Short mmCIF file of C-alpha atoms in Angstrom, two decimals:
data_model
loop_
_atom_site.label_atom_id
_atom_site.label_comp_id
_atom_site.label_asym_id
_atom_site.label_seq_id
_atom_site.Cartn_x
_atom_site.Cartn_y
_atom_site.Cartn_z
CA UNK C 12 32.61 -21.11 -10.38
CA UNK C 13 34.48 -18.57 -8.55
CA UNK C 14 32.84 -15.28 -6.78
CA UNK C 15 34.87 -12.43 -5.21
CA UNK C 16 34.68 -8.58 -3.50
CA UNK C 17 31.54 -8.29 -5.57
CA UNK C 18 31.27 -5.20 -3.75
CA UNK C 19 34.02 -2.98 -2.46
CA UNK C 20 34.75 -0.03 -0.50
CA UNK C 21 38.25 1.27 -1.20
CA UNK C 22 37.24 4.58 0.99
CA UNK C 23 35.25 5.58 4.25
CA UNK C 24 31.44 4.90 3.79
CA UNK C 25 29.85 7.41 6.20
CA UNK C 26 26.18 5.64 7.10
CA UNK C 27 24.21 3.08 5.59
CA UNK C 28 20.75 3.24 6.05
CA UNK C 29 19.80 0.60 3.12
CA UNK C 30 20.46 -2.69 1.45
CA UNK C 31 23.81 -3.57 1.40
CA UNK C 32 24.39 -7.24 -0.36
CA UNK C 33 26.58 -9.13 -2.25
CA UNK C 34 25.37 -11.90 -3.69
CA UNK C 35 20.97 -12.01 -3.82
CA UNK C 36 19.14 -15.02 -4.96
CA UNK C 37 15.87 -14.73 -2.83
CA UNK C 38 14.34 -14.21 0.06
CA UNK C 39 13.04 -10.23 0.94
CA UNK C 40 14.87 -7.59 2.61
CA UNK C 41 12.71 -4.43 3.67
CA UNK C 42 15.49 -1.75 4.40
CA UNK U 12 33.59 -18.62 -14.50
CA UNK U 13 34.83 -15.51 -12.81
CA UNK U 14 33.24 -12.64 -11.13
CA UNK U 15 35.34 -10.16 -9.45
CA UNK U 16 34.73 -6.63 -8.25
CA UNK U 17 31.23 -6.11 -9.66
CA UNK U 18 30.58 -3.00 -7.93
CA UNK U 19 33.48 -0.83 -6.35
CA UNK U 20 34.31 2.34 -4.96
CA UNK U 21 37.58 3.81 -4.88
CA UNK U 22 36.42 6.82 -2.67
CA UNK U 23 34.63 7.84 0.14
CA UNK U 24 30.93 7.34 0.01
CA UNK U 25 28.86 10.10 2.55
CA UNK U 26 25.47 7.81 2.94
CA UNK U 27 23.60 4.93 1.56
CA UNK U 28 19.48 5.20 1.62
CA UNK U 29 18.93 3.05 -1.77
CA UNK U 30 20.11 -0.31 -2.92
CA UNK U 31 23.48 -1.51 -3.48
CA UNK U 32 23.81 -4.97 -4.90
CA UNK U 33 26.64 -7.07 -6.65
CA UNK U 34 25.11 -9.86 -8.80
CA UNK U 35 21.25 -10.32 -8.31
CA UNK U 36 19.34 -12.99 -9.48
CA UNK U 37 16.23 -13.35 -7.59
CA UNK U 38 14.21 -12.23 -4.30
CA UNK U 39 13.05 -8.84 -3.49
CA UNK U 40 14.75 -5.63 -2.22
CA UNK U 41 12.47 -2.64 -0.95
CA UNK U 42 15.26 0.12 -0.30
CA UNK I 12 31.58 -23.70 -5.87
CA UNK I 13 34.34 -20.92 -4.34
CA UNK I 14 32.80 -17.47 -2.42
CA UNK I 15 34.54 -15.04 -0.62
CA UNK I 16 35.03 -11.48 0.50
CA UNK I 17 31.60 -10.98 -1.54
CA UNK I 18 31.36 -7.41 0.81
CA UNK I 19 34.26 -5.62 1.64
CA UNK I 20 35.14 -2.58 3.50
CA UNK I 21 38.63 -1.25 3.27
CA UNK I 22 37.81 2.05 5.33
CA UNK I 23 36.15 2.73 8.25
CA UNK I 24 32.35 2.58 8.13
CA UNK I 25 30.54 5.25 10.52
CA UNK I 26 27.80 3.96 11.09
CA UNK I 27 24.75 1.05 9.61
CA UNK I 28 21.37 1.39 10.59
CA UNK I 29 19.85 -0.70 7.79
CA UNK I 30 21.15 -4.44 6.34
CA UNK I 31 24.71 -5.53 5.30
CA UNK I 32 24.14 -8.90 3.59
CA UNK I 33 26.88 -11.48 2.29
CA UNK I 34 24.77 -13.99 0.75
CA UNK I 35 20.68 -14.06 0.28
CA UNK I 36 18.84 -17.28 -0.65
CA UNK I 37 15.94 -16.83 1.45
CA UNK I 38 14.11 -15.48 4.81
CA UNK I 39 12.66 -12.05 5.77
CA UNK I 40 14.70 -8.99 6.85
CA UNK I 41 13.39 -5.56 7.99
CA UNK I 42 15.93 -3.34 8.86
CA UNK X 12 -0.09 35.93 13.75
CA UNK X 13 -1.88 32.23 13.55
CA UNK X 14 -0.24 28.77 12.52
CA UNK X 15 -2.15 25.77 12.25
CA UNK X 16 -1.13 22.15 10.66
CA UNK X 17 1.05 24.06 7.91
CA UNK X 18 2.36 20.22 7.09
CA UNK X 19 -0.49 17.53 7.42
CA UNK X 20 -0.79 13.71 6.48
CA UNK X 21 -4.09 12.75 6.61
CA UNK X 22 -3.26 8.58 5.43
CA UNK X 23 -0.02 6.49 6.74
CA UNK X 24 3.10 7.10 5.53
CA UNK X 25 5.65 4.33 4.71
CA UNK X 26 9.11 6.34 5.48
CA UNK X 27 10.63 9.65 5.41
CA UNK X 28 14.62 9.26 4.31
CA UNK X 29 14.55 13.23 3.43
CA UNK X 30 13.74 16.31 5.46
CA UNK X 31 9.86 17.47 6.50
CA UNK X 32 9.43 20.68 7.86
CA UNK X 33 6.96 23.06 9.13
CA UNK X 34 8.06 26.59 9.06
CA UNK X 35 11.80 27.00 8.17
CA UNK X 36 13.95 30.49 8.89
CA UNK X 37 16.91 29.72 9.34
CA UNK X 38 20.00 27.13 9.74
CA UNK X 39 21.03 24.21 7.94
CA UNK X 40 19.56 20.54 6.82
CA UNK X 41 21.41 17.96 5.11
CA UNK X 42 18.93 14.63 5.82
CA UNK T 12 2.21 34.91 17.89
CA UNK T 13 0.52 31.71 18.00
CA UNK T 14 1.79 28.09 16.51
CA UNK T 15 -0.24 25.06 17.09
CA UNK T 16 0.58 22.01 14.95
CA UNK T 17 3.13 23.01 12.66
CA UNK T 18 3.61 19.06 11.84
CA UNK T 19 1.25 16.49 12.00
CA UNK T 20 0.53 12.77 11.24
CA UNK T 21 -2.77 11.76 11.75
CA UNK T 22 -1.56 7.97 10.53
CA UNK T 23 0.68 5.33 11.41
CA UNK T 24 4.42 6.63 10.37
CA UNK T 25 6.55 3.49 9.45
CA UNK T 26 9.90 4.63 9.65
CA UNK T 27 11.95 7.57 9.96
CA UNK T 28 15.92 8.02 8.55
CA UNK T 29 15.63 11.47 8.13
CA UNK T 30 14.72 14.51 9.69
CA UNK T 31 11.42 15.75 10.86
CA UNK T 32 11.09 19.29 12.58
CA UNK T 33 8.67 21.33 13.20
CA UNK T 34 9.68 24.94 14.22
CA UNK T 35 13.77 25.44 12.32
CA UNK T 36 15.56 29.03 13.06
CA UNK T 37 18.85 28.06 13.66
CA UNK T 38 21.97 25.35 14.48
CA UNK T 39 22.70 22.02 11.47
CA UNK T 40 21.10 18.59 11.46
CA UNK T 41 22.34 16.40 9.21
CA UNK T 42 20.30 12.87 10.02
CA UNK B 12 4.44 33.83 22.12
CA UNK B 13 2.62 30.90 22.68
CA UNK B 14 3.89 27.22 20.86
CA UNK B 15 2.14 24.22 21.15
CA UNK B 16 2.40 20.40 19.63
CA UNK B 17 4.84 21.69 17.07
CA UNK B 18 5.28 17.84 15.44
CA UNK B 19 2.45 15.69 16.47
CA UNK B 20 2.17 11.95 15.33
CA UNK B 21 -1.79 10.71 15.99
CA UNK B 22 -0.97 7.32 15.17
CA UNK B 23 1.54 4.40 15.80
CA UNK B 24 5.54 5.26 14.83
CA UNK B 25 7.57 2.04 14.20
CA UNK B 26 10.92 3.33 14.44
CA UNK B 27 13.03 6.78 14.26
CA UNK B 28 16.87 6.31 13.24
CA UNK B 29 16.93 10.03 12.23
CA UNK B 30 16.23 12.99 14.59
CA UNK B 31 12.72 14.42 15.47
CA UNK B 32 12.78 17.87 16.91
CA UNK B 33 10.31 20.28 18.03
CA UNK B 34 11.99 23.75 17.94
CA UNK B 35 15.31 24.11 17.08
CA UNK B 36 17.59 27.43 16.94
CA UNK B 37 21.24 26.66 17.34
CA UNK B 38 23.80 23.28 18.06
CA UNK B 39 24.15 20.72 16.28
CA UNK B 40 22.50 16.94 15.49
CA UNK B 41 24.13 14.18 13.59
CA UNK B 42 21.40 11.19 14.16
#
């Protein structure tokens, strides 16, 4: 079981104003 | 097993309001 | 069991206002 | 020349991620 | 010339991320 | 020329990440 850079920026991101996440298995996230 | 990369972005994103996510599985996400 | 770099951000980010999130299991964010 | 609640939310409103205007002329909006 | 109001929110307003203006002639938001 | 209460808000606001403005004719906003 190996897990990497799910998610990757090669370039400028500017703003976030939501979710980011990598790995979600539960819990809640309001953004 | 091997994940790698799921989600990537070679350039410059401007703004993130949404959801961005790599591997989901469970939990909630109100973007 | 093997994570890493599950977010990444090669560039320059401006600016986050909502969540960045490496791993989720569980718990409540409002961003 | 009378205006008068030209944009009007009577119930609650969750979030605005966009633009809401009144009375637009001129200029620019991105939101 | 009379405005009054040009915007209103007679509930509770969660969030905001974007813009909200009442009276726009001129200039650039971007939000 | 008379202006009054352009954007109003009767109830409880949680949060503003974005820009509110009443009148606007000329610079510039980034929020």
């Amino acid at each position: 079981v190996h897990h990497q850079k799910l998610v990757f920026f090669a370039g400028d991101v500017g703003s976030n104003k939501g979710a980011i996440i990598g790995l979600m298995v539960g819990g809640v996230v309001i953004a």
